[PDB]
Symmetry: T
Subunit: 142 residues, 12 copies
């Protein structure tokens, strides 16, 4: 029923910066798309974004206590944070890793995720629709 | 309108072998699920499987000439074939890489794909539903 | 006399999550054990935990100005943070690195610490008693 | 006209800690030197320091929206943060990376910067004067 | 009740050689300290040292048959011996790895132990007191 | 007072070849800019360029005997010559490494310098002004 | 009772090519030796060779469905094929890897097999008799 | 007199796909050019292409039995196939490796060939004329 | 006629320790099996075991002087000893390397043997029968 | 029309030293062969050899100013010189890299060229005829 | 005055085994040559050989207590033993490492010595005369 | 009879620069010592030094034509020059590599020599006497 969508560093800059790359969709519009699609699937999306690792960890902690699934786009921390991986290893519901860009078509350092090994699955390079597709997997898996 | 779903080596063994891991769904049932979901989205799925790299390459060639999108689960060749990557680099429509299992939770050799860098996107670890989610991306991107 | 015990990310989740692994002891109980053992050794333990690197750094800074020893379980940041290492390189009193789990029996990425090279010593895999043993070293080294 | 000087973790500890290494100049004195030199060049220096990655990212974001150049000494995050690099890749004005110490004469881990590839240029090992020299480049490049 | 303390190559040279580094304590004094502390904890320490891998292996074998815990400072063999690791993998009681020096502050080759992955825990860099702290863990874990 | 500016292989080709990359400034103009700026700082710049490692080494030798500072752009030899590093390790006055291009934004082989570890500091990617900024550091450090 | 001997690429060239190296025995003679020895052990050897990975995979599939043991000399695919490893991971009876030459005395690339980790055991460098010895293990293990 | 020109995977797609890169020459035209140039040199070119490794191996086998020289563009298998290398190691006449594109100016994985170590020589990056130049070497070496 | 079977460190612990892994067969029983099978083949097995590298080397030396073949299970020294390899490089009769467990299905460090490159062949993972199969190769190769 | 053939270190020793390896052809004879073949193609070959990197660089510079193609056998500098690569990156006409020996059949260090990535193409292992074949490519590409 | 010559594993096999490689000189003859040359230089050579690491360590210990110089050919342990290096790091007189063969012309694993970094110097590949030359250095350095 | 002593880059700076490290002996004194010792052995030493690789190569060439032995201290080029190695591979008389300092006790890059694999032997860390000891080997080997 409840699904947590968690965006990490720099995802608040979505729809600025690099139109050709991630889409001209902003993070507020992204919140709007997700919530609407979530309601259509009979779910509630709680969508949160932060540039603070501590904040992201608090949100993962709450999802762990609540046994709620998480869709997570950790931004740069995907490639660097063991702390975030440790927090997510607690999750009992599904963890779906989502990246807007195709991380495997960029620099080599982006082709390693500390999250993928513990995630249920990963969607990359499908733009903002990756979030919607993660919602749909979660809807068919209850 | 037309979408090619191409499975490589060992995907004909789906629904035997390892129930706990990939699902008790067989490849014939997979064909059935895909085709049904494809029709519901207003698409036609052509679903083909082969253990022969030459056969897979011929199918990619035909999709290249026809300018048709491809959903591709190359099996083991994902990690080993430069030939298949070269064939796919020709595709003008989208290429979505799909793996039933979470390749990042297995052996290290499975965490490198020669296909990901040239694919539009990648779905891993979401079971058979990854194919359906790839269909839906293709349906929203025409 | 005064000893600072500093826990980093995810150590507030101790005694939840993974009973078999780290103990069913919570972080509040850990605070209680440490403080009691500290008093028995004639020391005062100031025990602090945070998921925020900035907070951990502020605490290391204060210990540096006060010339106070530090027992540090940095959590995931053990393996990733150069910033925390730089802060700790200032410490003039002893720095004892402590990990509840045996980091050398887990993933390869956990077998490298940016802190060990500058620490006085390291205790891993001895459970919550590692903190108590660090206290005792500090008590015999004044 | 406006130039942002951004210092990351541990740069507030400048002028304590290690006299022989970075100078006995404090961060307040550094602010003072920069601002004075900036006025002499006809510029305004906004000089900010934080141990918080989130704070540094917010400041980079603001410089990106304002199209303002940045002189950045990210401290330890130089070597570890993909998030900070992603934020800086947005900057349209020049980014000058500055390190007080010669990072190439220290540990091997310090000889890789996630920032250098996207910076306009890099000054290392020239002490506090590196900041002043970055100001002068910015003054001659308008 | 019975605890085996096993020192490997060069530990008989303790208290010669390098006063500044390992202590001016000799191995006979070390035996004396351990035994005294062991009695105070209600344990019996059997402390043995050898430069011969075969001898160390025989001692590990005997501890394995007797189901006795082992505190082991294998000296150089820590970094090189698979044979010793195989012998120790048999131990059913706890194995505590102890190094007098901080092996992580020395050459890179010393930062890998074939023993750590199979040990219960590891104490490094706490001088001769590491042995005493290992005794205390063993005393609190019966 | 006297400062030696030493350019290595291919720096005589400056202002030909690649206008977009290094500037349309020629090496003669570079000599002119440096000398003029040097006089303005109260210094004398001796600016020499050679494609011959032996010649560069002779010049470093002379600066070593004269106890004169050196600004050095070794060209390709930056990345390849141990001989040049050995010659420069003799210098008692400051050695400032300068690269016109941002070597960290190019091929991986250019991100390692045999000179940086022994240089006082390094300026890269600031164009021809890097030489002028090196002069200014040398002027403020007498 | 039934045992499948499967040779991969280039094993049909046995007894040509390189007399000194693999033996002057041809593949037909090898079939003959195996079958004769198999009958003497009370087994039936089905011996098949192909240069086609697809063919080898079909044969492994059939052995998997039949729960029959396999002796496998995959030729070059030993070192390169993940597909073949995936097919063999299904086998419920024993898989014995056999190489005529000593692969560890040749090029480095030949010292890694994708098959060894999932095989029951491996025989290399014992010439054609390795096949016979694999038969004998299979005969003593029913 | 007789020379075998063997093209591997994807070489039948020549003259489609990527005009700027490999030429707008098709594989049929390539056959035509080769055969014509071969006759002019007094040779007969047998030119064959296949996407099937098994087919390529059969052709190498036949050239080995016939003691005929081979010009080989293995396509992607250049970088991946040990089987093909083993087949070619049998050749007693010259083996000339040919690549239309400059493989050293592309991805790193293309700069290693399993064939080059056993080939007589290698021609890369000279377009379709590389085949003609290989023919001419073979004509001057009888 | 005479064959030397040499077991290294920890092989005297066979049939204790790990029933599921190596067999509940003891080393005395192993001696008994080998000797009996050896007599049945018309050979004499001299079977020796030691935890001492010096002892193993003396035994290899004697086999070298006597021109006698050796079956060798060096235990942990397989992966670590250059000395043992040097001793074995002298052997003029066959050297067969034998491991009871499948070393390629364990830790990565066990997949490299200093002995395999100089051995005639290697048998791994076939349990105690590997020794018997080595005897049989030696019986068919006189 | 004009083509520059440039040989680097040790190519003046051709036809001495190692008859079996590079040919008993001397460098003077090589000059003679090239010039004759060049005239037959309607070209003029300027053939120069030097053991001095500075000399080679001067010659590349002149070809760059003259917009003349270069055939280059840099000798050992192939594998070591960034300076020479930088000089050659200026060339606007074709650069053909030529090696008499098959560099891929020798030591590993010879299988990397700093020149190949910027060359038009590469000919190796075809003996002295590689130079002639490079001439012919240049003749067909005007 | 007194000099210790210490040979490790397999050096007692000198003058057997491999005439072409190390010389037909035996270890007894080597003792004889050394002692004679030592007397001629006014020194006493104590020459000892053992296949036992423990024995070698005891001998190094005695030289350490006696402040006597050591010439050491550790055999295979050169490349593998940290224990022996630790023992030798105690030596206050000179340590000269000697290898009869040129270790840099053999396998890659032989080109790393744990002893060279702590030795005064190293002589390799000069046959048995390396020992004599080490004696002469020791004679000129008192 | 005639022996060539060849010093490479920076060896003319001997006896300046770093008294503690290489000796206060100058290169002229070194020439004097060598020549005197050479005469005492009945040899003639031709001692030459250059900072120019081309010059060193010319000298190696002359020794190759004259079949004269070479003692070579290539300086920095030891670690970097393939050209010099190629020149030296021609030498038919002995090549002895000599380094004044212990290259294995310095930076890692100095522990690899392109010359050692082709030299007869190597002397390092024995100061200027290494040259004299090389002379003596050459005197005993005619
Ligand atoms: O923050 C990141 C990257 O560090 C990550 O490699 C990909 C990533 O997770 C993705 O494609 O979604 C994300 C990409 C990305 C950014 F890198 C970024 F800076 C943004 F501002 C942004 F909106 C964005 F989506
Ligand atoms: O063939 C493979 C693997 O080599 C790949 O790493 C994952 C993979 O592409 C996926 O999870 O879909 C696929 C996994 C896989 C198998 F490995 C396999 F053997 C099957 F029989 C099968 F049905 C299957 F799905
Ligand atoms: O946070 C970590 C790990 O990242 C670290 O590798 C070990 C570690 O420092 C330790 O064993 O103490 C610590 C382990 C750890 C956790 F990883 C974690 F998620 C917790 F919730 C927790 F309570 C805990 F103790
Ligand atoms: O924080 C860092 C290092 O992590 C970085 O490698 C160099 C670095 O960016 C520089 O030399 O400026 C900076 C060095 C540094 C510190 F590492 C540090 F801890 C300080 F307290 C400080 F003031 C300081 F300048
Ligand atoms: O023998 C060793 C080293 O090889 C190991 O790296 C650390 C080590 O196990 C420790 O710090 O206890 C130990 C250190 C050490 C020594 F290296 C040594 F040579 C001694 F003589 C000694 F007394 C000693 F304690
Ligand atoms: O010669 C080099 C490069 O090899 C080096 O990597 C950067 C480098 O030192 C710099 O950016 O200054 C310099 C760059 C460079 C060149 F590479 C070059 F070829 C020139 F002709 C030139 F003028 C030039 F400046
Ligand atoms: O095909 C291979 C090699 O690729 C593999 O490394 C060893 C290998 O499996 C073995 O020794 O059996 C096999 C060796 C081998 C060959 F490489 C080969 F080309 C043959 F023609 C052949 F008959 C043969 F036995
Ligand atoms: O198939 C390949 C590549 O995998 C190889 O790296 C280069 C390669 O052998 C060459 O440049 O000839 C060849 C290049 C290549 C292709 F990669 C390809 F997909 C084609 F369709 C094609 F016609 C073609 F020539
Ligand atoms: O001693 C070893 C290992 O170090 C080796 O990797 C495998 C090994 O040679 C084999 O499987 O035979 C052997 C395995 C092994 C053991 F590792 C061991 F500790 C035993 F007690 C034992 F009986 C045994 F057989
Ligand atoms: O100088 C070199 C080598 O360093 C390079 O690896 C191959 C190389 O460029 C080629 O095969 O042409 C060339 C080979 C080579 C030599 F290495 C050499 F020493 C010569 F004397 C010579 F005549 C020669 F041709
Ligand atoms: O034992 C060794 C080798 O492991 C080492 O790499 C070289 C080494 O130290 C040397 O050349 O002296 C020595 C060489 C060596 C041997 F390897 C060996 F087996 C002998 F029997 C022997 F007499 C001998 F001298
Ligand atoms: O030039 C070098 C070094 O590059 C090399 O690593 C050691 C080296 O060959 C030796 O110890 O002899 C030599 C050392 C060396 C120097 F590095 C140097 F700069 C000198 F000025 C000098 F006199 C000298 F001997």
């Amino acid at each position: 029923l409840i699904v947590n969508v968690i965006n990490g560093p720099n995802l608040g800059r979505l729809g600025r910066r690099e139109p050709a790359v991630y889409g001209g969709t902003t993070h507020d519009e992204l919140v709007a798309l997700i919530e609407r699609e979530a309601a259509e699937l009979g779910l509630k999306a709680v969508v949160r974004q932060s540039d603070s690792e501590a904040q992201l960890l608090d949100w993962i902690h709450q999802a762990a206590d609540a046994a709620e699934p998480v869709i997570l786009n950790a931004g740069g921390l995907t490639h660097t944070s063991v702390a975030l991986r440790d927090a997510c290893a607690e999750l009992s519901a599904p963890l779906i890793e989502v990246h807007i860009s195709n991380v495997h078509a960029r620099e080599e350092f982006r082709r390693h995720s500390y999250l993928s090994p513990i995630a249920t699955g990963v969607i990359v390079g499908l733009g903002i629709q990756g979030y919607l597709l993660a919602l749909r997997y979660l809807a068919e898996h209850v």
